[PDB]
Amino acid sequence: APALAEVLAPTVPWPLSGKNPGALQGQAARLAAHLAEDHDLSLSDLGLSLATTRARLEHRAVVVLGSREEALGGLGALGEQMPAGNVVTGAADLSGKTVFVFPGQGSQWAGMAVELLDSSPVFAARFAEVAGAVEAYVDWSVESVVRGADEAPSLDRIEILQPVLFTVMVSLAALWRAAGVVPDAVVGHCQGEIAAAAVSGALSLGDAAQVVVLRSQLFADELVGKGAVASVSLPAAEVEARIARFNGDAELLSIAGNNGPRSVTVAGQVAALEELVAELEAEGVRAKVIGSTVASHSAQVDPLHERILDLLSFVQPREGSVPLYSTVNGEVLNGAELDASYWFENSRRPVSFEPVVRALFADGFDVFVESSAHPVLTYGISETAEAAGREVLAQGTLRREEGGLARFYSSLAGVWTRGVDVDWAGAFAGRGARVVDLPTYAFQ
Amino acid sequence: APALAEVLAPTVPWPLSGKNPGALQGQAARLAAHLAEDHDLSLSDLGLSLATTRARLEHRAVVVLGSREEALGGLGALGEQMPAGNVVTGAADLSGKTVFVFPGQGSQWAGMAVELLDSSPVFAARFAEVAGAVEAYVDWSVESVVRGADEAPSLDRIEILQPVLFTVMVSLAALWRAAGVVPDAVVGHCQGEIAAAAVSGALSLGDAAQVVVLRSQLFADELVGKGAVASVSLPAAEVEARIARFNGDAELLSIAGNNGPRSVTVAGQVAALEELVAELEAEGVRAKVIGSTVASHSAQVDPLHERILDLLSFVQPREGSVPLYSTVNGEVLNGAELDASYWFENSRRPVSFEPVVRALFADGFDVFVESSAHPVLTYGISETAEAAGREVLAQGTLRREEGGLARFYSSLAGVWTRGVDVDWAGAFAGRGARVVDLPTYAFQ
Amino acid sequence: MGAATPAERDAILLDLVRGQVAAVLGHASGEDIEPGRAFKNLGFDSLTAVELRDRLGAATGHKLPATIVFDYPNPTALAQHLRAAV
Ligand SMILES: *C1=CC(=O)N(CCCCN2C(=O)C=C(SCCNC(=O)CCNC(=O)[C@H](O)C(C)(C)COP(*)(=O)O)C2=O)C1=O
Numbered sequence: 020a021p022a023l024a025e026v027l028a029p030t031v032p033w034p035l036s037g038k039n040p041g042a043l044q045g046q047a048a049r050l051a052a053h054l055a056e057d058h059d060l061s062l063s064d065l066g067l068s069l070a071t072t073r074a075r076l077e078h079r080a081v082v083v084l085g086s087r088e089e090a091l092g093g094l095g096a097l098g099e100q101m102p103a104g105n106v107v108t109g110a111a112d113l114s115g116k117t118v119f120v121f122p123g124q125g126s127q128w129a130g131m132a133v134e135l136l137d138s139s140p141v142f143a144a145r146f147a148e149v150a151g152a153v154e155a156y157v158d159w160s161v162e163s164v165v166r167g168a169d170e171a172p173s174l175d176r177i178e179i180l181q182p183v184l185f186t187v188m189v190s191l192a193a194l195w196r197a198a199g200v201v202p203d204a205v206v207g208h209c210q211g212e213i214a215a216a217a218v219s220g221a222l223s224l225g226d227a228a229q230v231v232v233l234r235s236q237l238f239a240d241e242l243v244g245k246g247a248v249a250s251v252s253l254p255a256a257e258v259e260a261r262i263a264r265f266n267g268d269a270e271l272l273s274i275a276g277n278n279g280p281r282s283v284t285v286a287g288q289v290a291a292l293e294e295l296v297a298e299l300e301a302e303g304v305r306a307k308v309i310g311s312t313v314a315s316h317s318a319q320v321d322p323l324h325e326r327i328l329d330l331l332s333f334v335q336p337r338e339g340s341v342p343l344y345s346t347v348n349g350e351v352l353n354g355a356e357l358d359a360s361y362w363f364e365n366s367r368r369p370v371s372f373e374p375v376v377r378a379l380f381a382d383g384f385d386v387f388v389e390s391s392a393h394p395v396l397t398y399g400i401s402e403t404a405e406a407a408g409r410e411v412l413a414q415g416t417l418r419r420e421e422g423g424l425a426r427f428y429s430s431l432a433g434v435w436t437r438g439v440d441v442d443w444a445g446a447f448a449g450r451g452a453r454v455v456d457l458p459t460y461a462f463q
Numbered sequence: 464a465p466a467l468a469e470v471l472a473p474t475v476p477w478p479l480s481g482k483n484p485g486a487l488q489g490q491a492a493r494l495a496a497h498l499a500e501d502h503d504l505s506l507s508d509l510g511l512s513l514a515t516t517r518a519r520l521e522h523r524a525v526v527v528l529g530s531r532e533e534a535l536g537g538l539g540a541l542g543e544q545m546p547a548g549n550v551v552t553g554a555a556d557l558s559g560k561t562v563f564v565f566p567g568q569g570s571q572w573a574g575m576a577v578e579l580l581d582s583s584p585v586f587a588a589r590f591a592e593v594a595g596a597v598e599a600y601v602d603w604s605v606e607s608v609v610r611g612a613d614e615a616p617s618l619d620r621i622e623i624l625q626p627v628l629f630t631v632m633v634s635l636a637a638l639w640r641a642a643g644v645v646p647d648a649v650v651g652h653c654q655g656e657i658a659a660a661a662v663s664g665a666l667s668l669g670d671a672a673q674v675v676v677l678r679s680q681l682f683a684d685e686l687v688g689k690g691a692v693a694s695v696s697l698p699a700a701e702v703e704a705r706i707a708r709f710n711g712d713a714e715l716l717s718i719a720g721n722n723g724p725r726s727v728t729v730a731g732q733v734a735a736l737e738e739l740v741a742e743l744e745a746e747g748v749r750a751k752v753i754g755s756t757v758a759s760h761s762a763q764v765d766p767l768h769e770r771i772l773d774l775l776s777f778v779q780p781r782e783g784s785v786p787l788y789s790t791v792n793g794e795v796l797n798g799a800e801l802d803a804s805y806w807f808e809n810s811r812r813p814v815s816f817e818p819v820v821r822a823l824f825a826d827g828f829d830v831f832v833e834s835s836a837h838p839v840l841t842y843g844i845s846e847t848a849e850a851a852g853r854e855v856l857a858q859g860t861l862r863r864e865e866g867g868l869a870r871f872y873s874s875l876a877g878v879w880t881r882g883v884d885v886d887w888a889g890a891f892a893g894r895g896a897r898v899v900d901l902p903t904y905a906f907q
Numbered sequence: 908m909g910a911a912t913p914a915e916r917d918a919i920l921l922d923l924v925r926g927q928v929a930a931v932l933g934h935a936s937g938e939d940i941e942p943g944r945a946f947k948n949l950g951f952d953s954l955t956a957v958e959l960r961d962r963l964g965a966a967t968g969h970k971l972p973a974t975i976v977f978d979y980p981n982p983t984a985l986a987q988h989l990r991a992a993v
């Protein structure tokens with residue numbers, strides 16, 4: 020029922036496709052002249068007409084426009100083989116087998132989700148549903164946090180951050196689904212698996228919400244101050260060797276995430292971690308301690324085992340609608356095995372991301388949609404793809420300071436232009452747009 | 464959330480695909496060798512595994528199977544490039560822009576939707592919802608009629624058939640939608656436009672139900688006996704010429720529909736119509752009186768104009784989710800213009816099917832799903848593609864005496880092997896299928 | 908650019924970095940970017956920094972540090988470092 024776009028949202032997308040690049044330029048120039056000549060044309064009529072009455076062809080370009088002059092700018096640049104900030108182009112050369120990627124922390128920024136609360140009814144609807152479910156288990160308001168009201172808790176607090184990023188990531192998924200982009204599989208990084216399970220339907224919304232709320236609250240109580248996570252731009256095995264120096268006679272530092280060929284996360288007590296980061300900042304290596312992070316995925320969580328199994332005894336896992344590529348046990352779960360023990364293992368075992376990306380590649384997944392507010396895993400996935408000679412698209416949803424329909428439609432165009440089927444017609448729903456006559460070029 | 468298939472239902476589909484026909488038949492023969500070695504392998508595990516873990520490639524097959532025997536049979540055949548009844552093959556060379564076709568009478572057969580009520584929860588749930596809307600306006604049960612219950616009225620009567628065909632068509636649309644195949648547009652033939660408007664949301668179920676019930680009851684009261692419609696396999700022009708022989712003084716016969724370059728419907732008084740059909744058979748021309756028809760799409764509905772306007776004054780047409788290509792006016796409609804007067808024009812105007820099939824080719828539609836119990840319009844469409852030089856798929860849903868998951872998955876495969884994206888994983892819902900290792904044929 | 912003066916080198920590398928930044932920004936003018944303006948002010952997150960580095964690596968046919976954009980804040984500074992790099 021809820022639409023991609025508020026009926027008064029000025030942003031709309033114009034999808035175009037030709038046989039070859041010259042046909043795409045010619046139709047764009049014709050379309051520009053069609054618009055220039057008639058000041059009375061509805062941008063929604065033309066959009067609906069492009070999205071409904073045009074052949075789907077290999078060479079693709081989407082113009083994201085909120086006005087005539089943004090449409091003439093886009094179609095002008097398109098027409099003279101020139102780039103532009105609001106034109107996304109590509110060849111439909113991918114199979115479009117899609118995996119939705121739910122990271123943990125690092126996606127967050129102040130203002131995330133706001134522009135879409137005000138401008139996307141689908142996003143708003145899903146955000147209300149999911150927020151509604153988390154607010155059974157907390158006293159604060161998810162919308163109020165996201166909108167940055169005076170009274171609202173701080174995102175610096177792991178126990179506010181996790182439930183919020185969960186709402187945002189799960190709500191972004193439903194916006195893709197309304198655009199016609201459904202996952203054929205789902206992957207999650209630590210707390211991202213809680214979102215993937217909600218999006219897969221393996222956990223009820225209510226059960227998923229309660230897990231991220233109770234586990235992040237348990238970490239705020241037991242683990243804040245006693246340890247953190249650091250990111251290091253070395254292969255994991257190289258970092259394992261360096262870690263051995265510290266934590267000689269006990270696990271003070273442990274690998275927390277094999278994220279990439281040259282990207283690993285380490286967890287443990289703050290001092291050992293800061294010593295490791297400085298020793299490595301010396302030898303040119305990109306290593307930093309992530310803020311608002313506890314030393315999960317380490318021995319520090321072993322003592323909370325009995326408390327976590329009781330806290331999450333309520334979870335009734337069930338078979339989901341798509342497979343979850345576990346980054347805990349490296350299996351292809353159907354979701355019915357995501358009980359209390361899984362959610363302990365999810366918070367204890369080092370995140371095995373790098374190998375499930377390779378496994379996904381081999382299984383023929385060639386489109387990676389990160390259902391997040393800023394891309395934390397997509398560049399890693401691209402770097403892995405090129406090191407392996409694979410053609411994939413790793414596509415983020417929103418970015419820092421770009422969190423509205425213009426950004427969504429650009430990300431939606433990233434995936435359409437590379438051969439994912441998209442319901443562009445849905446951009447115009449509820450507007451009473453009509454199909455109108457379009458210039459034909461070399462065809463139609 | 465209703466499921467394609469009952470857990471207990473033996474029928475599952477196995478999708479395969481290869482870079483080329485030889486790899487496809489190579490992969491088939493390798494997979495049959497795997498299945499033959501181990502009697503312990505779950506057909507549902509291998510099903511879900513084939514749906515999820517294998518690249519999506521140009522050259523495609525689906526094995527429809529309720530047993531190890533039918534699996535090895537399919538795969539042995541596929542491996543020896545030999546046709547089998549339970550194997551659909553094709554190359555994914557269509558864009559898969561899909562238009563849903565809704566015919567009128569001709570698709571009915573005894574027990575048409577019984578296997579799907581008994582074994583597809585999604586089809587059963589949608590059949591209950593649509594029937595319930597119809598049963599607000601009649602004293603009989605659509606289920607009872609379809610099942611052949613003793614007390615149930617006869618399908619021979621136009622006023623039972625139309626609403627039953629309405630129920631079956633709209634329900635079949637929802638079965639496709641559950642397998643991940645949704646219309647990019649809808650077309651209908653006479654009454655089939657009502658099913659089209661129901662599926663597109665242009666009419667409410669309640670409105671659409673009441674239109675088909677009341678109009679079919681009107682024609683039963685005013686028109687039965689006074690005329691009928693026949694199919695003739697000649698061009699419109701040559702049928703106009705043949706018609707003129709009977710149309711000496713008062714006109715007894717006229718073109719009711721243009722359906723195909725050599726496919727045409729004629730309406731008029733029964734004696735004239737039988738005489739026309741009888742003299743055509745003598746020559747070797749395919750022609751039949753269609754069973755339970757009246758001389759709709761003719762001057763005989765002219766005196767019903769006022770009564771139809773009064774009878775269908777309740778309708779509240781609205782913008783639907785997909786455009787409706789009107790056979791009556793040859794316009795692309797959002798569904799808000801389907802008022803009483805339109806439903807009169809739908810019952811009076813000769814049906815331009817063939818011209819709007821041409822308009823749909825030209826707007827890039829290369830897949831035509833007929834949401835029907837037996838193909839009536841797919842042959843016309845194909846012949847229309849041949850004459851306009853277009854590569855299209857024209858794909859029925861069910862056939863006479865084949866009305867279960869084996870025929871639906873065989874129609875779903877027909878659409879998939881030509882390059883419509885389908886949600887194969889959905890066929891394994893409820894079964895606790897688990898992804899398993901599959902023999903690799905080539906680099907993965 | 909061996910048959911080119913130092914000032915000519917400065918100018919070609921400055922035209923390269925400004926063109927590549929404009930492509931990442933999407934303006935695509937290639938002269939819109941101000942040589943003095945810092946990347947932060949232009950609208951640069953960490954992701955835009957590594958995209959600029961990828962494009963400059965491609966164009967110069969060299970492998971550059973991921974932090975090179977951060978380390979040399981303005982186009983002029985990055986151009987000047989690239990004289991040392993190539
Ligand atoms: C999940 C596990 C865990 O420990 N959590 C606590 C929060 C940390 C979550 N994090 C990290 O921050 C580290 C990883 S993955 C991201 C690391 N990068 C790569 O994969 C390598 C290549 N990419 C990049 O260098 C950066 O993406 C860019 C510089 C290109 C982007 O720049 P800006 O956006 O900074 C992880 O999982 C959990 O909650």
Ligand SMILES: *C1=CC(=O)N(CCCCN2C(=O)C=CC2=O)C1=O
Pocket residue numbers: 566567568569652653654692694719720722726728753756759760839840
């Ligand atoms: C609506 C108009 C009409 O003619 N009929 C259905 C009978 C015609 C069935 N058809 C075709 O549509 C073409 C071939 C054929 O047999 C109504 O119900």
